[PDB]
Write a protein that binds this ligand. Structure first.
Ligand SMILES: Nc1ncnc2c1ncn2[C@@H]1O[C@H](CO)[C@@H](NC(=O)[C@@H](N)CO)[C@H]1O
Ligand SMILES: Nc1ncnc2c1ncn2[C@@H]1O[C@H](CO)[C@@H](NC(=O)[C@@H](N)CO)[C@H]1O
Ligand SMILES: [Mg+2]
Ligand SMILES: [Mg+2]
Lengths: 136, 136
């Protein structure tokens, strides 16, 4: 699993066209104030152990930033070892569920299988942009 | 070299604190309208051949999107095989120079060695977010 953590002042997205024949989540749009935005690329080897490590890490980082909103944003572009779309969707559902057991704030999982527009205002402090890898 | 291509309606950044002992570029800030924003991670094996392939690709993609501004945005977070900071800075200067020989619009290389805030409004069409690898 490859993640990018962006500490945002604000974030919003809108699904536009479908990117899979039948996107497994409905279309939608949402906007947020301050948040940790986690761009999340699910990889071929990812399983339950991977999901739990990433959930732990996201919670730990969120705590250190003092953020109370996490956005789990599915993202196909951070890796060249992608899991197939249905497995990736399952692992993202699992990550959202695991994160809720470790982090007390708002957890928003953005819809999977859509092309999306987005806007982000990313903070510029030293911990505002980090990347992470998890495996098992 | 690992790149992320984001087709933006607007982009802006500001250097904040230095991220290297002596950043090789001055502090600064800039904002743009529609542009191709290229987050660029220089990797250990990158040399002149790599730079030329990436410059060709960026020009080709820009043409297909009908964009007339490219932002070359140094980014440490897209790879786990980073070139050292001074080599990365040299390859980014080279990429900017090579791109000008292939693409006729505005080429802006953002300062290297700074933590930066940024804001982007990324389009949501099917070619608005792509990633690329180059090697030699
Ligand atoms: N292995 C994987 N890891 C994470 N997300 C994955 C994935 N495989 C498919 N997706 C999702 O399907 C959309 C089309 O690739 C993806 N959409 C996107 O990546 C948008 N940000 C493009 O605008 C994403 O929702
Ligand atoms: N191998 C490499 N490829 C691309 N850029 C590289 C690099 N090694 C160092 N940098 C630059 O040094 C700043 C601190 O890592 C980096 N700064 C950043 O990546 C900001 N976006 C953080 O706010 C970047 O300017
Ligand atoms: Mg809509
Ligand atoms: Mg300033």
């Amino acid at each position: 699993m490859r993640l990018l953590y962006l500490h945002a002042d604000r974030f919003e997205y809108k699904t536009v066209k479908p990117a899979l024949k039948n996107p497994p989540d409905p279309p939608g749009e949402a906007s947020f104030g301050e948040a940790l935005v986690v761009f999340t690329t699910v990889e071929d080897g990812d399983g339950p152990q991977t999901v739990m490590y990433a959930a732990s890490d996201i919670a730990s980082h969120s705590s250190r930033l003092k953020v109370t909103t996490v956005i789990l944003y599915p993202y196909a572009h951070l890796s060249s070892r992608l899991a197939k779309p249905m497995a990736a969707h399952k692992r993202l559902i699992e990550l959202e569920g695991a994160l809720r057991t470790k982090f007390p704030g708002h957890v928003h999982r953005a819809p999977f299988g859509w092309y999306k527009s987005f806007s982000i205002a990313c903070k510029g402090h030293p911990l505002a942009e980090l990347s992470r890898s998890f495996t098992e």
